[PDB]
Every structure is written in C-alpha cells, then in structure tokens.
Amino acid sequence: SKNLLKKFASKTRKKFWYEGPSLGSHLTPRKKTRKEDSIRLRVLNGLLYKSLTELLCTPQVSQEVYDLNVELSKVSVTSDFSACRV
Amino acid sequence: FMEPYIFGNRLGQDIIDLDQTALNLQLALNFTAHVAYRKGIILFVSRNRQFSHLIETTAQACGEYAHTRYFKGGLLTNAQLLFGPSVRLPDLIIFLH
Amino acid sequence: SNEDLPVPMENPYKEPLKKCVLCEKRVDYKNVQLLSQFISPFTGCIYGRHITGLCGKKQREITKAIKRAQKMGFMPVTYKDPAYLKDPRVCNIRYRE
Amino acid sequence: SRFSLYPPVPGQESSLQWAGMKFEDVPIAHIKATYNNTQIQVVSATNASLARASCGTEGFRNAKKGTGIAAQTAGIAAAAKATGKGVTHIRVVVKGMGPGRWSAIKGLTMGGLEVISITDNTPVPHXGCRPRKARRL
Amino acid sequence: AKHLKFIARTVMVQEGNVEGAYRTLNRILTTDGLTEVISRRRYYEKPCRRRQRESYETCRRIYNMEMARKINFLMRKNRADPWLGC
Amino acid sequence: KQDDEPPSSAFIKEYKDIIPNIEKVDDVVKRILSLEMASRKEKLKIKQEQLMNKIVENPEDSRTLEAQIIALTVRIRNYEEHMQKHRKDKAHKRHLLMSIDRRKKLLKILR
Amino acid sequence: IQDIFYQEDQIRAKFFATYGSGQKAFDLFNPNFKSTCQRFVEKYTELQNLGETDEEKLFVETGKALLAEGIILRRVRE
Amino acid sequence: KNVLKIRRRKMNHHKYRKLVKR
Amino acid sequence: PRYELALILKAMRRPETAAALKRTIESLMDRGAIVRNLESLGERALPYRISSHSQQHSRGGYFLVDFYAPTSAVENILEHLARDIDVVRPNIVKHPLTQEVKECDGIVPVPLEEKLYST
Amino acid sequence: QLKEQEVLKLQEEAKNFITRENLEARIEEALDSPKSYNWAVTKEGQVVRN
Amino acid sequence: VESFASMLRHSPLTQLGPAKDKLVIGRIFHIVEDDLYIDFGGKFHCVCKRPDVDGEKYQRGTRVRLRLLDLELTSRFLGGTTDTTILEADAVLLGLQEIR
RNA sequence: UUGUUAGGACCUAAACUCAAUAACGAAAGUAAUUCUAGUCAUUUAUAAUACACGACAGCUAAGACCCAAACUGGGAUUAGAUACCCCACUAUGCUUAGCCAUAAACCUAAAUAAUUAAUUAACAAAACUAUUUGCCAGAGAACUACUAGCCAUAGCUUAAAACUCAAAGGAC
Numbered sequence A: 001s002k003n004l005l006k007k008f009a010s011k012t013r014k015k016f017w018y019e020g021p022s023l024g025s026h027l028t029p030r031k032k033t034r035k036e037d038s039i040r041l042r043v044l045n046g047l048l049y050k051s052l053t054e055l056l057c058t059p060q061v062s063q064e065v066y067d068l069n070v071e072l073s074k075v076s077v078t079s080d081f082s083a084c085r086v
Numbered sequence B: 001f002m003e004p005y006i007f008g009n010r011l012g013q014d015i016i017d018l019d020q021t022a023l024n025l026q027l028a029l030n031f032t033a034h035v036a037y038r039k040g041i042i043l044f045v046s047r048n049r050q051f052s053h054l055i056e057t058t059a060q061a062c063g064e065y066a067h068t069r070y071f072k073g074g075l076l077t078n079a080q081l082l083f084g085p086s087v088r089l090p091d092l093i094i095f096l097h
Numbered sequence C: 001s002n003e004d005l006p007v008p009m010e011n012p013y014k015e016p017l018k019k020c021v022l023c024e025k026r027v028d029y030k031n032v033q034l035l036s037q038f039i040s041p042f043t044g045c046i047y048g049r050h051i052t053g054l055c056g057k058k059q060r061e062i063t064k065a066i067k068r069a070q071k072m073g074f075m076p077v078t079y080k081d082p083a084y085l086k087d088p089r090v091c092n093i094r095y096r097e
Numbered sequence D: 001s002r003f004s005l006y007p008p009v010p011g012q013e014s015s016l017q018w019a020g021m022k023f024e025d026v027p028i029a030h031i032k033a034t035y036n037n038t039q040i041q042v043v044s045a046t047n048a049s050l051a052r053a054s055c056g057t058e059g060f061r062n063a064k065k066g067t068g069i070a071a072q073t074a075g076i077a078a079a080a081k082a083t084g085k086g087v088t089h090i091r092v093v094v095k096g097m098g099p100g101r102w103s104a105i106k107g108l109t110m111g112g113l114e115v116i117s118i119t120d121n122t123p124v125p126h127x128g129c130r131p132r133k134a135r136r137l
Numbered sequence E: 001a002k003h004l005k006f007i008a009r010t011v012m013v014q015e016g017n018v019e020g021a022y023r024t025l026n027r028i029l030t031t032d033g034l035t036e037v038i039s040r041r042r043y044y045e046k047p048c049r050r051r052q053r054e055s056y057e058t059c060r061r062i063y064n065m066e067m068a069r070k071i072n073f074l075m076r077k078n079r080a081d082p083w084l085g086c
Numbered sequence F: 001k002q003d004d005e006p007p008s009s010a011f012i013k014e015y016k017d018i019i020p021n022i023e024k025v026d027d028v029v030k031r032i033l034s035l036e037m038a039s040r041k042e043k044l045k046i047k048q049e050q051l052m053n054k055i056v057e058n059p060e061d062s063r064t065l066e067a068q069i070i071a072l073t074v075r076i077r078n079y080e081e082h083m084q085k086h087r088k089d090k091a092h093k094r095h096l097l098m099s100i101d102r103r104k105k106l107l108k109i110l111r
Numbered sequence G: 001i002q003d004i005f006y007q008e009d010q011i012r013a014k015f016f017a018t019y020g021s022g023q024k025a026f027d028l029f030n031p032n033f034k035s036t037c038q039r040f041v042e043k044y045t046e047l048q049n050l051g052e053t054d055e056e057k058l059f060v061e062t063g064k065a066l067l068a069e070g071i072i073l074r075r076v077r078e
Numbered sequence H: 001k002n003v004l005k006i007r008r009r010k011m012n013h014h015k016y017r018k019l020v021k022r
Numbered sequence I: 001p002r003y004e005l006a007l008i009l010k011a012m013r014r015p016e017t018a019a020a021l022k023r024t025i026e027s028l029m030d031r032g033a034i035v036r037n038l039e040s041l042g043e044r045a046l047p048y049r050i051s052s053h054s055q056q057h058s059r060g061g062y063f064l065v066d067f068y069a070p071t072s073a074v075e076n077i078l079e080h081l082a083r084d085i086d087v088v089r090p091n092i093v094k095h096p097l098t099q100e101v102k103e104c105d106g107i108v109p110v111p112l113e114e115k116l117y118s119t
Numbered sequence J: 001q002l003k004e005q006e007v008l009k010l011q012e013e014a015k016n017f018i019t020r021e022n023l024e025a026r027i028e029e030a031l032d033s034p035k036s037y038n039w040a041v042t043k044e045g046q047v048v049r050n
Numbered sequence K: 001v002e003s004f005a006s007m008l009r010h011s012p013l014t015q016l017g018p019a020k021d022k023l024v025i026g027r028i029f030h031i032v033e034d035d036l037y038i039d040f041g042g043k044f045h046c047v048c049k050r051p052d053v054d055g056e057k058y059q060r061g062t063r064v065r066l067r068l069l070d071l072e073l074t075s076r077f078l079g080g081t082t083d084t085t086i087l088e089a090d091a092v093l094l095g096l097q098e099i100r
Numbered sequence L: 001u002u003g004u005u006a007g008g009a010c011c012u013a014a015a016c017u018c019a020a021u022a023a024c025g026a027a028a029g030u031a032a033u034u035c036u037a038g039u040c041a042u043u044u045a046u047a048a049u050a051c052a053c054g055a056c057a058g059c060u061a062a063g064a065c066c067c068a069a070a071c072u073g074g075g076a077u078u079a080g081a082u083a084c085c086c087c088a089c090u091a092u093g094c095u096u097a098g099c100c101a102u103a104a105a106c107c108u109a110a111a112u113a114a115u116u117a118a119u120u121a122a123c124a125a126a127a128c129u130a131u132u133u134g135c136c137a138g139a140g141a142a143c144u145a146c147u148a149g150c151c152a153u154a155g156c157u158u159a160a161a162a163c164u165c166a167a168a169g170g171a172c
C-alpha cells in the first residue's frame, strides 16, 4: 500500500544502474566516456575493497600475511581495466 | 508472438511444434525455389559468428550471396549511395538468424 | 486421438523449498544458548537477517526472545556470554584478526 | 593451543600472567579521545590514580591541542610518570573517537609500557539524550 | 554500567603487536555498526531526514547488489574469442 | 446493567456441552475450564449464545439480521464497559460509535 | 503453454529421489539410448500391466527385477 | 517543478501578517 | 489463563530458599491460582547487577512456577512479589506451551521488483 | 472425541498439580533436580545438546 | 511414421528429466587455448577448462564425462522485461570417458 | 572545572542493534519489555447543515526538567551581519485536565468492480471501461474584503468584486 522505497527507487535507478545486456570493452582481459562505465567501475572498486579486505585480515592468503593484518587505504581499478592499484 | 508455434514447456525449455515447422518450412522452401527458378537474387543474412563461415560457404555453393558481417545502416534504403547508381537489390533475403 | 500427448499434472520433479535453521522449532527466551548464536561476541548486538540467514518470521521470534530474556534477567545486553563462545557458528560473519 | 582474542573470562582461572599478575590485576590506561583534547589517565586495579596527561598539559594550544602528534606526546608523558610509579603492563580502555585515539596508544608504547589488551568504551546510548542540532555550513 | 567490565569490545594483544590488535578492534566496531552510530550521534538527525537516508541507502544497496550480479553473470562469457576472423 | 451475566462456574463454549457428558470430572478441572480462568473474550461468547436462544428462532444460524444485531449488542455493551475505565481511549470510542451506527443500519433493514 | 509432463515422470521422480541418476552416464547422441532410469520405468510399467495397484509394491519389486538383471542400484539417501 | 506559485503566496501571507501586526 | 512465572530469587542456602518458594507459591494460591508445576534452573551469575530492596545482586536462584489464575490476579501477584525481600525480579508471562510452534513449508522469496516498485 | 480426550488428559495431568498438602515435598524435589532449556543448532539444522 | 508427440516422449532429453546434477557424455568440437567447447547433445554447448592432469588427452573428438547444472544460463535482472541469456550451458568436466 | 570509580542516588527524558523488515491503524500516527482490555460478519459504491477524530507549533491551570532549544545576552565574522559558526540561558518539547483544528495533513493516485486487446502528447505511476459522489472553468488581485459559524480575539473554516494583463501555467 505505502512503500518507503518507492520514493527513491527511480532516482537510484539512473545513478546506480544501467539497462541492457552489454558489458564494457574494458572489462575484458584484453574512447568515448560512458555513464555505464562509471557504474561498472564503481561497483568493482567496492567489491574488490570488500573482497580484498576478506583476504588480508583472513587466513586464506598465508600465515605471515594473516599476521600482517593489512588494512587498506583504498582500491582503484584502471579505466582500461588492464590492472588494479590496491 | 512465438507462442502459436510452441508445443509446450518441458521443465523450463520451450519446445517447438515440429508439425507447424514442417508446414511452414514447406511453404518457405517452396517460395525460395520459385524465386531461385526465376533467377532472383537471394541473400543469406546472419550475425551469429559461430556459423559465419558455414553460411558464407553455403551461399557460395548455392550460387547466391551472403552477408554475415556488420550491416551498414542504409545498405538497403540507401543502396545507390553505398553501391552505385544502378545496383540491383536482393529479391529475397533468408535470415538464418 | 494421440496416446503420446502430454498429460496435465503438477510438476513431479518440483524441488523442495529451503528452510531456515530454526524452521518448525520453538524459540524460547529461557534458551539463552540458542539466542546467543545470533548476537555479536564483542558488542552483543543482534545480527540482521542478511547475516543470520533466518526467515522473517524466525528473525522476529529471535528478536523478541532476546529482548525478553535481556529485560527479565536471563541474557546479557552488552556482550555475548563467554560460556556460549564455543557454540557452533551459524552466521555469515568473521571477526578474527 | 592458540591465542585467544577474547579476554580471560573474569572469575575463572587462566594460565596467562604478565609479570606475575593476572589479567584482573594489570593497571588500566583510560584514554578519552575527543575531537579537541586527548586526555590520558592510568590507574591501578583498585582504582588509584598513578599518571595523568593530556595535549593541554603538555603545552599545546587551540587547534594544535587536537592533533595526532599532540596525543603522542601526551602518551609518552603519561608513560614516563607511570613508569616511575612502577608500571610495566597496562590495559588500554580507549573511550572516544577523536584524532588522538590511536596516537595516544602509540605514545604509551613508545614510553616503555606494554599494552596487553585494548578495550573500547565509547558511549553508545540505547535510544538517551537528544544531540545538539546539525551545524549549517 | 551494571554489566561486567573488560568483556565487551575487548581485544587481546598477541606478541606485543599493539597495532594489529587496534586494527582488529576497529574492524569489530565498524562491522557491528558502532562507528557509524557514534558518527551520526554527534548531531541530531531529524526523523524525516533519517527516513529519507535509510530509504535511499536501501535502494542503493539493492541496485548495487543487483549490478554485481549482472556483471558476474555476464563475465562468464568473457573469454578468448573462439571465432576470431569471423 | 442487564438481566443475565454468566456465572463464574460456567464452562467455556468449547466444553460447555462436553463436560456434562463426561461421567466424573474433578473440581480443579472444572475450575480450569470455567469462566473464572478465562479471558473476558470467552465470557462474551457465552453472553451471545444465551441471547441467541432467547430471541432467534433458529439459534444455529448466525448470519441472519437478527443474529447480527445480537452480535453487535454484546460488542456495544462491551465497548461501553471498556470506555468507563479508559475515558480517553479514542480508538475504542470510535469502535463504540461505529457499532451503534452499524446496529441502527441493520435494525432499519430488519424493520 | 502446456507444461509437458508424461505419466512416466511420476515414476522417474521417485527413482531420482531414491537412487539418484544412474552411475552410467547419459549418452544423448545415441537416438535409441536406454538409461538405467528408463529401464526401471519400463519394468515398473510391465508390473503395473499385470494389475499391481500399490505403488510401494511396484517400486520394490522393480528394484528386485533389475537386481536379477545385474544392474547396480544404490539406494543413496545422501 | 518550480515553486514560483508558492513564492507568490509566501510573500502575500508574509506581508499580510505584518499588516495585521501593525 | 495459564501463566509462567519467572522468579529470580536472592542467592541463599537451601533452608531459606525452600522457605522463600513456599511463601511465594502460597501467595499465588491466595490470589485464586492453581499451581501446575515447579521447576528449578539452578543458581547462576546474573547477566548484570540487579538492585532490589537496597541490595546489589550478582547471583540469584532461577525458578519457574507454572499455574492458572484469573486475568485480574496477574497484577495483584506481581505487586505482592515485588514487596518480598527475597525476590530479585518477578516476571509473569503467558505460558509458552499455550502458544504452539507454527508449521512452515519453506521460504518462497519476494522478488526484487516487488520490493522496489510495490503495491 | 477431541474435546473429550483433551478434558481427560487435563484430568490425568491434574493428578500431579501442586497443592498445599504436597507443597513442601514438591519444592524439595524441584531443588534436587535442576532443569535446562539450553540447546544449540548447526548450519545444517541439527539440534546440538551438550 | 512416428508422430512428433511420440518422438518427444521417447527422446533421451525427455528421459533425462531435470538437468541439474545429472551425468552425461559430451564431445569436444572446438578448443581455444585451454578452453574446451563440449557438445553434450543439448541446444547449447558448455565451456570448461582443460584439466591439469592428462591435459594433452583432451583433443578434438575426445568424448568426456560431465555433470550438468543448467541447459541454458539465463537470468532476468531488475527492471528487465526478458531474461538475459549468454547462449551457453553449465556443466562441470569430470574427465575422459573410458573407451572400453 | 577535568579524568577514573566492578561507589551511592535518581527513575527525568528518550527507546541502539534487530530494521537489508514493510506490519498495524480511518487518517493522524504507531516498533524497549510484560500483563489486562481490544480490532471481526452491514452485498458493494455513494454524506452534511450531524457525530467522533486529527502531526508540529500555540493558548489555559498545576507539575516535571536529563538533554535539546525560538527569544535574549555574550564572543567571532563582515563595508554592515538584527544571520550562517562559538558559548550561556529561557518560552517550548514531558505529565495531568481543556482548548486550538492547521501541514508539501502529498502515493501531489476519490472509492468500487472489470479487462489486458480488439492502447505511446510528454514526463511520472502501462492503458482503459463502468457506477456514485465531490470538485474545476484564463492569470493576478486573493490562504484578501464583506457575511455567517466557532472555547478560536494578531485565529480557523466559508469566500467575492472592482481593477490590471494577453497571457499565466505544464512537459521536453
């Protein structure tokens, strides 16, 4: 009947989402700026920031690395998506 | 618009009635034969890249034409610019995809 | 007409619905050992249903039992009891180093 | 056969000692890290004051009083007074979330004190007092 | 106040690694949401303001989690070209 | 008040006709299943049944206008007792005035 | 769109729940392939033609018949 | 969606309230 | 109705604890109750320090009393128990067993389009 | 039938209810035998009782 | 002449039932570096990775064993009107089939 | 004054996490715990000159008072600063009685029962039929003047004309 999410559902749909089944040229292992690219690179930087902190302060990587307990300043992937800069 | 032709849904995968396919294929093959009989131009068109070489090889065997590459905007509506003054357009286009 | 035509029926292979780890179980305020499995060891804060993995109905049942146990003198508010630190881990959350 | 982050449970018996004292006996270093001044106090397990320091007492003033390096100096000063009184191991209860929250703990380590644990006691009301109104800028 | 001291929000230092313990305590408080709670309790957020923020953050989390699914889903097809030359 | 108020020793409507058949039941069991150890809601199910017998020709039917009117008279008298203690309860004051108006509407259709 | 469900599926669902998929691998390139499950359903049908009315009787008898044939049926609850 | 029509009413009511005060 | 008392008692020796449970259960009977069962849960450390009758308590004896009583007696019982000097904290609730574990067939999830664009 | 059974069950259960006559005796039996309502669960859903 | 309805009822794919966690035999028809394109008799092929053990054995025409998961990988996304498909199947390569 | 107190008092005020939930209620509104009372059947839509309600602010009397805070005072800034920032402290926010009856009281969606195809002004929230009531008829003047009713008295509801203009307004 009354949905609080309706107020902001349409605003966040252009800022945090794009339509169509298209993946960026950069996202492949191997131009004109687009808004979808900003979304496709913003989410990866957050996932890698969340996921690369689940390795430094966890035991999977190694025993010395686990002891290092390395917190991260920021994660930022290159627009070309050639490599990452953690 | 495809639901008329679907025999049913087998655990999520739509099945195509092969009886309607047989009737429709008979008409389509029959039409394609009279066009070829009358010496019309037939163009095979597809953008599926797995079958690009097969479809180009098929057209060459038939004696007809294939366009499996990127289709330029205006190829048919603006043919005279793209091809020349008196270019003859295809009389039939077969869309494998 | 045709003997081999498909027969209407409910899906024989329909997969069962997944249940929560507290489905069809009694959540009691006096069972502080079970309630402690859904709070934080350090702060004692109740976990959300995205961490606990419970359904809505059980998430509310655990929430009410924790608040009742805390307010009646059964469960500590600010931390998890050290006795229950060894109980199985059922929540998708990691805190160590 | 591993280290436990969880403090030795009070009232029980443990195998961990520091200079022949149990966890319940180690003196406590109370650090109040606010956004302007970082104060530090060390007390015995019977709640007797041993050392005290702060960015203000060290001599910093105004905006310098609330920097990381100002708290580090305050921690080193508190360590020196406590070390004289006979303190080698401290339990660090750090209240507050200001700039010298960590720096005060780093100064205490630089001053020759051995921190065995770090607690946090930042006040978190459970529903409490209305905070002051948002600043417009 | 009426609870026991040194059980809640307490971490133990391992091998005199006082920086590693402090980094662990912060991840615990950040994960339990105490850091965000203390940040927002410095000044008063009006009830209408609070509701607008929570509805926006919820919708941002939905569209972000959904965009992650779409990239992960469409990244399976990301591989060496099998039909090079056609 | 009203002529009839259910006694404290009366059984609830679920076991009203079941305990009499049972040959012998203890005093304690009779007290547990009486109206003394029940909520007020149970005491209202007994009041309604008594009125249906004394008024309706076919007490088995509860969907007749006469039965619906009896259902609203018990509620109205219940809401009135509620409002005598909770003088500033505005939700139940609305429940009382809306039930009175509902009864008047049904009495008009019955007439 | 009609969901395509034949009467054999009632039997097939039970076989997969009780024994899983046959350890022999499906070969979907052979147009006349007979799987372990399809042999179970063919025998289960034969017994039902005789007139057995109990599903439990038809399921345990069919298992015995295939055991005589030598097929390795593992009642894997896991 | 501008608020211009609301601003005209805003000024009318403000000026009217000051007239009543005088 | 059927009510479950949750009575935390002062930590005492068995002679005095038994006297406290006789005085308590007698009060329930004096309020028109029918006691059904008595359970002990053992003496333990309280989750926090409770102050009753000008004394701070860290340990108490946990007991349950199952009984029946009229709806009007619940308040009188809690009032009386709060005045007793050997009762750290009395709490009457409706008996849990009177409430029956519901039956569930699983979790059919809500779609995300319904969550955002909703009725 | 259901209500007759439910009434009969309560009559049998009422045999073991507490009364003034057996109060002191029932109090001592309770103190001797403590009860525990604590149990835990696993990721699978099994109940673990220590 | 057999009818289409009969052909579908007696089809190996109809006998397979649900394709989740089923075992099937496939054939490698295309290889791209260490990626194997395997036809298991369905509409869409699957793509697996060359196993470290006996890598050289997996050549074109080699029949293998698979554990199916989905016959087509598809999923509707928030705000979509149709399911997005990657035109691929999901299977886990188990190893070579014994010729015997 | 400050920091600590596993010291005492207080029960004022407000209810973290749960809540990534979307329940209850006519709306307003409502989420610390417990208990008591309690929501329910009119076929359905359709009501005012009647009745009962109605956030916040405000008024009346007696209390409360942790914190917040119009106003006010003090300090900064500025050409000025009757402001934004800093500090202090009131009315007030709380309780109990009564009044007041207003909100962007806005899902800017009247209610109800159908339909999804024989249907893109734009944007928003797909289109559209039927039934009943309410409401609208260029913009401003105008949440104004006068009238009547009201515990309202610098108030609310009801609500024009002269006169001016050739536009005002909505979406892209």
Ligand code: FES
Residues within 6 Å of the ligand: C018, C019, C020, C022, C023, C024, C054, C055, C057, C058, I104, I105, I106, I107
């Ligand atoms: S899924 Fe059944 S109660 Fe949670």
Ligand SMILES: [K+]
Residues within 6 Å of the ligand: L106
């Ligand atoms: K609105």
Ligand SMILES: [Mg+2]
Residues within 6 Å of the ligand: H008, H011, H012
């Ligand atoms: Mg004007």
Ligand SMILES: [Mg+2]
Residues within 6 Å of the ligand: none
């Ligand atoms: Mg001033």
Ligand SMILES: [Mg+2]
Residues within 6 Å of the ligand: none
């Ligand atoms: Mg004041």
Ligand SMILES: [Mg+2]
Residues within 6 Å of the ligand: none
């Ligand atoms: Mg109005």
Ligand SMILES: [Mg+2]
Residues within 6 Å of the ligand: none
């Ligand atoms: Mg509102």
Ligand SMILES: [Mg+2]
Residues within 6 Å of the ligand: L143
């Ligand atoms: Mg107005």
Ligand SMILES: [Mg+2]
Residues within 6 Å of the ligand: none
């Ligand atoms: Mg006016």
Ligand SMILES: [Mg+2]
Residues within 6 Å of the ligand: none
């Ligand atoms: Mg007037």
